[PDB]
Amino acid sequence: QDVQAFLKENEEVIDQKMIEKSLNKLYEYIEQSKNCSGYHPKLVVNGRSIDIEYYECPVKKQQSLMKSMYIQQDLLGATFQQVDISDPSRLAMFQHVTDFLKSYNETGKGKGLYLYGKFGVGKTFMLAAIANELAEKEYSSMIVYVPEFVRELKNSLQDQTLEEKLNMVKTTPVLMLDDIGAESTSWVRDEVIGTVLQHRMSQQLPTFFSSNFSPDELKHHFTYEKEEVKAARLMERILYLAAPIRLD
């Protein structure tokens, strides 16, 4: 009922066929729960690929703490009593929130989580849930938006410009990284947002890590011998700051 509308809206742009190529996507789309009403997902055409951007809900004392860059403040507001649990493993999370603030101090160490799904499975309400309570106190879990962050963190690592806004992805007691896999020079893997993984298990910090998809399969994604038994160990460099749980 939405796809039809979008299709004809951009049918001048959206080359044809593909259905069979994106079969997996469209089938996974219908198979899942999907749906939604601080933001909403909308499709956008970026070059030759179609992405999913969040626009603030038109329906629009923690946000002096909960200020995240490269995403807006209309769409950061979800709690834990705002709870109508319908799908499974959204239930298997009632000891990874209340007990994910009682011992996540400053250099507490261990294993958080690895959120995933497709492109909008109430992720911005669980990365907005679990965290709030940490910052409801003087504890830690920074919000950050990677697909928007990096867009100039290739060409802003310069003359103090963003140089000085970009050492705090390494030193805040905790910090999250969002829907990477969106786009991507390969230096940022080990210079901008791969510099989040070595300086956080060397002094060790209880950091959150999210994504469009999962670490166990984010190990073979980018091959547009090398990164196969070599693309797995960044999902390993990921695997130790957190303990993975389902999002069915």
* Per-residue interface string for the shown chain with its own copies, residues 28-67, x marking contact by CB under 8 A: x-xxx-----------------------------------
236: its two tokens:
């390993």
Question: 197 and 185 in contact (C-beta within 8 Å)?
Answer: no
Q: Dihedral, CA atoms, 198, 202, 205, 209, nearest 10 degrees?
A: 20
Residue 248 Cβ vs its own copies, minimum distance, rounded to whole Å: 8
Using CB under 8 A as the binding rule, whether residue 14 contacts its own copies is answered as no
Interface residue with its own copies, options 6, 187, 236, 243 (CB under 8 A): 236
Compute the distance between CA of residue 155 and CA of residue 152 in angstroms, rounded to an integer: 5
Report the candidate in 93, 67, 74, 247 with the shortest Cα–Cα distance to residue 168: 67
Closer to its own copies by Cβ: residue 89 or 155:
89
CB of 28 to its own copies, least distance (A): 7
Asked whether position 19 contacts its own copies by CB under 8 A, the answer is no
Q: Annotation-wise, does 40 bind a ligand?
A: yes
Are 40 and 74 within 8 A, CB to CB? Answer: no
Q: Is 15 in the site for its own copies (CB under 8 A)?
A: no
What's the rounded Cα separation, in Å, for the pair 139 and 133?
8
- Give the residues lining the site for its own copies (CB under 8 A): 28, 30-32, 229-230, 232-233, 236
